[PDB]
Design a protein around this ligand. Sequence first.
Ligand SMILES: OC[C@H]1O[C@H](O[C@H]2[C@H](O)[C@@H](O)[C@@H](O)O[C@@H]2CO)[C@H](O)[C@@H](O)[C@@H]1O
Ligand SMILES: *[C@@H]1O[C@H](CO)[C@@H](O)[C@H](O)[C@H]1NC(C)=O
Ligand SMILES: [Zn+2]
Ligand SMILES: [Zn+2]
Ligand SMILES: [Zn+2]
Ligand SMILES: [Zn+2]
Ligand SMILES: [Zn+2]
Ligand SMILES: [Zn+2]
Ligand SMILES: [Zn+2]
Ligand SMILES: [Zn+2]
Length: 233
Amino acid sequence: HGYMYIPSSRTRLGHEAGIDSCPECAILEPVSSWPDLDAAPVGRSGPCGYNARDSIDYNQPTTNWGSDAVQSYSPGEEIEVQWCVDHNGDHGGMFTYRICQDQSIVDKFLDPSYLPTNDEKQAAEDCFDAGLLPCTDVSGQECGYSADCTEGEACWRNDWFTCNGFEASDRPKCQGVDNAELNSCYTSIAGGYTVTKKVKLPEYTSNHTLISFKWNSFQTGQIYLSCADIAIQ
Ligand SMILES: OC[C@H]1O[C@H](O[C@H]2[C@H](O)[C@@H](O)[C@@H](O)O[C@@H]2CO)[C@H](O)[C@@H](O)[C@@H]1O
Ligand SMILES: *[C@@H]1O[C@H](CO)[C@@H](O)[C@H](O)[C@H]1NC(C)=O
Ligand SMILES: [Zn+2]
Ligand SMILES: [Zn+2]
Ligand SMILES: [Zn+2]
Ligand SMILES: [Zn+2]
Ligand SMILES: [Zn+2]
Ligand SMILES: [Zn+2]
Ligand SMILES: [Zn+2]
Ligand SMILES: [Zn+2]
């Protein structure tokens, strides 16, 4: 249970606008989430997420999200990205952020009068995967391998970020990355913890595009997706 927090995702805005009672609940399941992190179809979840709790499809703007960029950045800027994990749903695993560099694809997700089909969601997901923002593009950022993976498996990749080990004595799981205080970010079930990293934005301009967060579980078959509206100018 988690969602993207900084920049402010559509899911965060759905919470703050009073629409989404459980932002951390928007989940892609059942799926195979491990060890192949990208094979599972995204279905109705798409790159922005679908929350079954209040029947919210974040792939479509509404009055409450998706209308405009929440934040503006520069091409190639190294930026803070943060997600929020619920205390009762800290799965460990691996996560990443992606930007699709095909504006015409993205445009179908920016139209309050249009809901992308599942096929359009998948074509967009493939563009996002091509646009993954590697951990290793940020000088000095330590980009390790998961304690839940072995070399030779499709999870053995340090373009994705990893949470800390599930079984670690000290600072386990995703909460252990920042070791922040409880309620450092909002979740509805048991309160949230921040999970913070840096990414290098692409050398690409847009007045309105998306960054999509993806978090895959290792111990259960579950993926969490969110997306934030951004500008790169
Ligand atoms: O407090 C009002 C809120 O209650 C329920 O949502 C809870 C949910 O039951 C918990 O599992 C967790 O997600 O916190 C939620 C927010 O309090 C109702 O389902 C919801 O409709 C209502 O707004
Ligand atoms: C953003 O919109 C302004 C006004 O139309 C325009 O001048 C500029 O080129 C646009 N930027 C991009 C990256 O398309
Ligand atoms: Zn969960
Ligand atoms: Zn709040
Ligand atoms: Zn794959
Ligand atoms: Zn600029
Ligand atoms: Zn605890
Ligand atoms: Zn295009
Ligand atoms: Zn294995
Ligand atoms: Zn086990």
